[PDB]
Every structure is written in C-alpha cells, then in structure tokens.
Amino acid sequence: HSAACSRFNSDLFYDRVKVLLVDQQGLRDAYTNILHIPESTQSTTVLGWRRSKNDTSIVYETVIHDNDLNKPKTGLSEIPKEIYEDVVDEDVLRAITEQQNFEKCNEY
Amino acid sequence: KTRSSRAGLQFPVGRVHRLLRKGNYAERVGAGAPVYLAAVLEYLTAEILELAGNAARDNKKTRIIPRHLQLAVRNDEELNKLLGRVTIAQGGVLPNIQSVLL
Amino acid sequence: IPSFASWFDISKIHEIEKRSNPDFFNDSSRFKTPKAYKDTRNFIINTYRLSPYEYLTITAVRRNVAMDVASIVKIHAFLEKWGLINYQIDPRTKPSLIGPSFTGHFQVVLDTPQGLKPFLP
Amino acid sequence: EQEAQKLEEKALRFLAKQTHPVIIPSFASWFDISKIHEIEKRSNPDFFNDSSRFKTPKAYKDTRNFIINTYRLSPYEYLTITAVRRNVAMDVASIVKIHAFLEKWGLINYQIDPRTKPSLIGPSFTGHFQVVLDTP
Amino acid sequence: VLPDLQDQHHNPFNILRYPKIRDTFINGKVVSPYRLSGEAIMIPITLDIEHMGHTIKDQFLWNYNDDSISPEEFASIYCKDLDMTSATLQTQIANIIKEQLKDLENIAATEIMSDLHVIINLTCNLQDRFFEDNFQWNLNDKSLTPERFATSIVQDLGLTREFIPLISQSLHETILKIKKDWVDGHLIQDHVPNDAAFGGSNWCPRVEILTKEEIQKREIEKERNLRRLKRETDR
Amino acid sequence: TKSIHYSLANFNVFQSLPKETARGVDDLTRMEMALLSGIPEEIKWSLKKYLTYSNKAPYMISL
C-alpha cells in the first residue's frame, strides 16, 4: 500500500540524522583531513561584501542575508516563458511571476 | 513425436521414463517425473561440460580429458561438495603445496 | 498546499505538464503511456498527502512503483518545481549531499610581488 | 524573535572556523565559490557548450567547489588527485584537467611560506567589512 | 575528531590537540608539485594489481574519446601520489588499462535507437558496508546519467561521498554488459518485477539496504547463474 | 623562540627540507601568468617588468 511508502520516507530521515548528527557533527573524509558535513547546513553562493566607515582596527564578520524566510525556495528558474505563458489564467500567472521575481531578487 | 522436443530438452525423456519404470523404484511413475529428472540431468551435464570446456581452453586444449574434468569438479566448491566421495580415474590431484614446505 | 500554480488537479491532465515532458504522449512504447503517467502522478501525490512535512525522496517512491527511474526522476523534478508536493518542509529533511564544509567566509590573503596583502574589495 | 536567535545559533553551530590562512598569488584574485569567470570558460575545461551529457556546468561547480573546499580547510597538506578521484564520480581526464587548471593559477597546492614575505597595508584603508551569505 | 567545526583561537597550535592531525605531521612527507571532444562515451576500467608487499584495487572511468592525458602519465601521477613509484609499476598499469580499453572500445551506446527496458540488479562493495540493489532502467535515455542516479542514491541514504564513484562505475560496467549481448540475440522481453495489471504486497525485491555481514560468494554464484542464463536464451 | 608551542612552523618534517625556491611562482612565470589575467592595474606591472627585462636581460625573455 501507499501508506508504507511514507513509512519508508519517514524513518529513512531518522537514519540520516542518526549517522550525521550524533557523532562529531559529521564523518571524517578518511582521505583528507576534512570533516565532511552535509551541505544543507553550512552555506552557498556568497553574495558579496558591504563596507562601512570607521582608526587602525579592521573588523571581519559573517552575516546571513535573506528577503523572506517563510516563502520557501522552489523552481520556476528553469521554466522559460514559452512553456507556461501561452494559455493560463492571469491570476496564477501573476502568482508565478511573483514567486519567480522573488526567486531572482533573493540573490541581489 | 518425441517428448524431448516438446519439453525442449536434449536428453531422452522416453529412455529416462523406461529406466524409471523397469528400475522397480515404485509401481507407478507419473508423466512429469521423467521430464523433471531429464531437466536436472541436462542442467548438471551442461554445467560440468561448460566448466570442463573453460578449463580446457585455459590449458589451450580443444579436447576434454579426465584431467580437465577433475580440475573443473575440484575448482567449483559446489560440485566438489557433491562429488567429494567420488574418485576420477586419470585425474590426479590438484597442485597444492603448503606454505611451510615452500 | 500550493499557493501558486493552482491549475493542478487529480482528475484530469493539464496542458502545462504535457509541454513539460512530451515523451509521454507521443510515444507508443509499451512501458510508457499517459495512463501510467497519470497513475504514477496521482500516486506520488496520494503518498505525499499522508505527511506534508517531510522531503519525498526518489528512492522512497521508487520502492513500489513499476516505472523506469529515468522517467520517475523526470516527473519527480516536475512536482517540486511547482507549488506541488515539496512546498511545506521542515529544515532537517533534505537530500543534503555530504560534502566538505563550506568556504568563502575565510580571510584569504594575496601575494603581491611587494609583500602579502589582505583581500578586501 | 526567538527563532532568529535559534537560527543564528544553529548557523554558527554548523560553520567552519578558520584556523589557517589561505594565500592566493594575487594574479588569481578573481573567483568566488559561486561564480565562474570568463577565464574558466575559455581555458581548457570545456564542460560548457554542451559537448556531452556527462559533463555540465553543474558538475563543474560541484567539483570545483569540492576541490577548493577540501584544500582551504587544510592548507598545510597537499591535494593529491588520487583522493579527489576517489571522492568524485567524474571521468579521470576531466578530474586531472581541472586539477592542473586550479594548480596552474595557484588556487590549490600553492608552494608558499609566509616567513619570507612581510606584511603591508593595501590601497583599501581600514573599514568595517561583512560577507553576506545565503541562508542555509 | 577533526578541527573543522570546532572553535580554535588565533593560534593554530591548538590543532595539535587532535590525534588525526598530528598523525599527518609526525610522519608526513615533503613533495614537489608535478608538472603536466565530440560525443563523450564513458568506459570503466577496473584493475587489481598485486606487485609489492601491498596490493592496489580501484576503478575509474576513462572516456577515451578525448586526448589530454595518456595511460602513461596517469600511472606517472597515480604512483607518485601513492609514493610507490617504480618503472615496473607504471608499466604494469599501462599494461592493464590499455587492454581494458581495446577490449571495450568496440562497444558504444551510439546508434542504439531502440526503446529497451532492463531490470538492473547490481552489487557494490567498498570493503565495508557493501550493498546490492535492483531496479528498472530504460535504455535509450539521455536525461538521467548514472552519475546523477548515484548522487540521488548517496543523498537519500546515509552514505559517505566515496560511494558516488563506486555505484556509478559498477553501473556502467553493467550497461556495457547490457550492450554486449546487444550485438546479438538481445531481444527485449517484457521483464517486470512488479505491477498491478498492465506494464504490490511488499518491496522485498526492491531493496537498497546496506549489509555489513559479507555474503562474499556472489562471484561464483553470479557466474553459475550467468552461465545457465546464457544457455536459456537458445532453447 | 624556536618551539612548537610558540608557533607551528617547524615540527619535525619541514625545517630544512623545503626547496630554496618555495616562496611562490618565479619572477618569470609570475609575469607570464599575470599577463593573461583580465585584471587591469596588474597588466600595468607585468608589462613594466617585461619592459625592464627587455633592456637589462633580453637574452632571458627571448621569443
């Protein structure tokens, strides 16, 4: 039955966090002295620098920028204007271009 | 019309059925027992012949000899377990020198 | 629950998904047919509707659908690009490839033929 | 709110801490872990122009950002290509090609000791610097 | 265990507190930096060399359709990396990865043009937590490369990165086998593992689990199965 | 002074083993590599040192 499908999709998640979050945060590379950490946690796509005025000290800090946390990332970047713009009602079409422009504006 | 062609085998179904009948193993013999026995026999024969041919080709020989049969039956652990109590004439023993004697 | 692209329905097939993978409606292959495509799509949905808080992986649905993975991944990457199944998610559940720790926030220095220099834009 | 503080805590939790400096030869300053410069496209790697289906710009970033990340976390050690080939599923020709390319511009395995080069102040004066990163 | 996510102060000396970092410092080595299209088809290359007191075993795919390194330079860097450089070892490597190519160069996935479906049942082993799995794979498809399927498998399960270049290669070898009998009697019968009417109590056949306990007997078992299976086609 | 705790720059495997030319790219390769990079203000230095080696040692950068 299909109910057992999620029964495998649920526990397979618990095994992942089992082998990756109870040890020293991740598995040693065993070929290089690198601690392999699942990539969903660290970062991706540095967006640049922001410099402000300050007389000898120099400060370096890491900040995380975002526009909307409760509107999750999705596709629509791999959707061209030929496939969907042909014939759709303008209501969801506006919701599409809204999500898409948000997807593009999130990266400056 | 021979039953071997109907069953799809190369072994004689009629001869196997006759041997089962006149062997006094029972008083009656079904129709699926001869074809089943012929299937098992032809499978075993094909496996042994394939192993012997591979052994002969490894020894660049195009004719199977008892030595090749011995090598093929002793290399495969399954047939070795099956025919462990059976000796083969002109087959010798496989070369195996102990580490303490080398 | 989708907030955009509300054209989807489990009853019929829309034209937007036909243009996505045309190899499902023009091929006379024995294994691929629009009837099986609609069946597997309705299965992916009915199996995600049981708990809309986890990430539906490809092997999970692969466990019990008789369809080539080459098309399973094709339609699965289609139901994530829209408001479809993967739109309400918790942080922990993710494919989350096991790579090395990220770099880019490290302080890199340059080697000018006149001496070391900090890398500041 | 409280979830913003929990997010910052969990972010710094799973974050690499810099313990060794990294040195670029100052003629290869152009790059980040998200952009592919024109030099990388016109050089020997030709994953672009869709010459095949096995190599793609996605696999190019998925391998370059693996090599740079493996090197910059332990710059004291030397990057051997046998470990890289043991970790990536790309064909050998491309792995060695991209490795020789990265070593050519001195991005990885740059032979340097900081005891023979004195410090200096760059044209950019002291300020207040930040690095913006996407939410994980 | 490793100073990657832990916090060390400005002084790098703290890294010495870990054993797996001082290990690469007490008995390390100093090395010198080495000095070095069209349709791409992938050809895996397996090699099990037993020359020195230690033996080497690994697999890798070559894609000989391009020419940027030769089978001699690859061994020249594969032995320099392992620091077991020997003229006899480089020649031994160039004497094995060339026959694999010449033997497999004649088979390419081009001009197939046949919608073929096969139940791929493969088995991988990395001398720890080996596994086996069988699924439905459709030939004549270019969207899903075995590398992407391998990345999906390593992502869904809790597998280390070193399993990506292990399941993909062993999969390519199977593809070559599926293409081998294609040069002859390779008619594709409707071979299914499950269905509903046209072309499920449980997924006992469809298994991707990992097993630590070694069932190190498949080599003979597969050959036993393969030999009989090949004779089944003729009838 | 010379101690592991003071600084980790010579533990047991690199205090006289590194070659004498391990301080970066050589002054010629540096010129050749900083000449095809697209950054300005850098070409203005490579083409200054090539211009120097064309009047003080031309036999070194001959075509």
End-to-end CA distance of chain D: 19
Written as six digits, the tokens of D30 are 């152009």
A65, with CB counted inside 10 A (0-12, 13-18, 19+), is middle
Q: Are strands E55-61 and A27-28 parallel, antiparallel or unpaired?
A: unpaired
DSSP 8-state secondary structure symbol assigned to residue E44: E
Distance CA C99, CA A29 (A): 9
Are the Cβ atoms of B76 and E220 closer than 8 angstroms? yes
D133 CA: distance to closest CA in chain A (Å): 5
8 A C-beta contact, residue A19 and residue E129: no
Nearest beta carbon to residue E26 from set F5, F12, F14: F12
Whose structure tokens read 């791999």? A78
C-alpha distance from residue E182 to each of E39, E106, E187, F34 (Å): 21, 12, 8, 53
Cα-to-chain-centroid distance, residue B43? 8
Q: Is E222 helix (H, G, I), strand (E, B) or coil?
A: helix
SS3 of chain A: the string is CCHHHHHHHHHHHHHHHHHHHCCCCCEECCCCCCEEEECCCCCCCCCEEEEECCCCCCEEEEEEECCCCCCCCCCCCCCCCCCCCCCCCHHHHHHHHHHHHHHHHCCC
Characterise A25 by phi-psi region: left (phi > 0), alpha (psi -120 to 50), beta (else). left
Distance CA C54, CA A7 (A): 11
DSSP 8-state secondary structure symbol assigned to residue F45: H
Q: Are strands E55-61 and E44-50 parallel, antiparallel or unpaired?
A: antiparallel
Q: Which of E120, E137, E133 is nearest to E159 (CA)?
A: E133
Q: Are strands D128-134 and E44-50 parallel, antiparallel or unpaired?
A: unpaired
Whose structure tokens read 């990265």? D102
C-alpha distance from residue A21 to each of A81, C54, C88 (Å): 42, 18, 23
Are the Cβ atoms of E228 and B8 closer than 8 angstroms? no
8 A C-beta contact, residue E225 and residue E154: no
Portion 16-45 of A in contact with C at CB < 8 A: 16-17, 20, 26-27, 29, 34-44
Nearest beta carbon to residue A28 from set E20, E157, E158: E20
The number of distinct structural domains making up chain A is 1
Distance CA E139, CA E118 (A): 8
Written as six digits, the tokens of B68 are 């090749």
Q: What are the boundaries of each domain within chain B?
A: 1-102
Query: E strand or H helix at E136, and its extent?
Result: strand E130-138
Distance CA A74, CA C84 (A): 10
End-to-end CA distance of chain F: 49
Distance CA A16, CA A23 (A): 12
C contacts of A36 (beta carbons < 8 Å): 98-101
Q: Is F50 helix (H, G, I), strand (E, B) or coil?
A: helix
Nearest beta carbon to residue A33 from set E20, E156, E157: E20
Written as six digits, the tokens of C101 are 């720790």
Are the Cβ atoms of A15 and E1 closer than 8 angstroms? no
Cα-to-chain-centroid distance, residue D77? 15
Query: E strand or H helix at D51, and its extent?
Result: none
Helix locations, F13-52, DSSP H:
27-33, 43-52
- β-bridge mates for residue E134, sequence order: E121
E102, with CB counted inside 10 A (0-12, 13-18, 19+), is exposed
Q: Which architecture characterizes domain B1-102 according to CATH?
A: Orthogonal Bundle (1.10)
Q: Is F31 helix (H, G, I), strand (E, B) or coil?
A: helix
Resolution (in Å) of the shown entry? 15.0
Are the Cβ atoms of C68 and E143 closer than 8 angstroms? no
Buried b (16+ CB within 10 A) or exposed e, A68-105: eeeeeebbbeebeeeebeeebeeebbebbbebbeeeee
B contacts of E227 (beta carbons < 8 Å): 47, 50
**Method for structure elucidation:** cryo-EM
Distance CA B67, CA F31 (A): 73
Q: Is E45 helix (H, G, I), strand (E, B) or coil?
A: strand
Written as six digits, the tokens of B69 are 């049969």
Distance CA D99, CA E74 (A): 13
Whose structure tokens read 């060390």? E8
- Residue A76: domain span: 1-108
Helix axes E87-94, E97-104, angle to 10 degrees: 10
Could you tell me where the beta strands, DSSP code E, fall in chain A? 27-28, 35-38, 48-52, 59-65
Q: In what order do the strands lie in the sheet with C98-100?
A: A27-28, A35-38, C98-100
Q: Which residues of E touch F (CB under 8 A)?
A: 12-13, 15-16, 25-30, 32
C15 phi, psi to nearest 5 deg: -75, -20
Amino acid at E207: V
Written as six digits, the tokens of E32 are 């010198």
Cα-to-chain-centroid distance, residue B67? 15
E220–chain B Cβ distance below 8 A for any pair: yes
Nearest beta carbon to residue A35 from set E4, E24, E157: E4
DSSP 8-state secondary structure symbol assigned to residue E32: P
D48 CA: distance to closest CA in chain E (Å): 12
Q: Which of C68, C78, C97, C105 best tests the E interface by mutation, with the highest count of E CBs <10 A?
A: C68
A9 phi, psi to nearest 5 deg: -75, -20
Distance CA D80, CA D110 (A): 13
Q: Which of E146, E152, E160, E131 is nearest to E61 (CA)?
A: E146
Q: Find all residues with CB under 8 Å of D46, minimum gap 6, and list them.
A: E37
Distance CA E8, CA D84 (A): 27
Written as six digits, the tokens of D135 are 């939410």
Buried b (16+ CB within 10 A) or exposed e, F10-41: eeeebeeeeeeeebbbeeeebbebbeebeeee
Nearest beta carbon to residue A64 from set D33, D128, D135: D135
DSSP 8-state secondary structure symbol assigned to residue C118: E
Distance CA A29, CA E2 (A): 10
Distance CA D133, CA C86 (A): 24
Q: CA-CA-CA-CA torsion for D73, D76, D79, D82, nearest 10 degrees?
A: -100
Distance CA A65, CA A107 (A): 9
Q: Is E134 helix (H, G, I), strand (E, B) or coil?
A: strand
Q: Are strands A59-65 and D128-134 parallel, antiparallel or unpaired?
A: parallel
Neighbours of chain F (3+ CB pairs under 8 A): C, D, E
Amino acid at C118: P
Are the Cβ atoms of F27 and C113 closer than 8 angstroms? yes
E139 CA: distance to closest CA in chain B (Å): 31
C-alpha distance from residue C75 to each of C17, C117, E136, E197 (Å): 9, 51, 15, 22
Q: Is E131 helix (H, G, I), strand (E, B) or coil?
A: strand
E63 phi, psi to nearest 5 deg: 60, 65
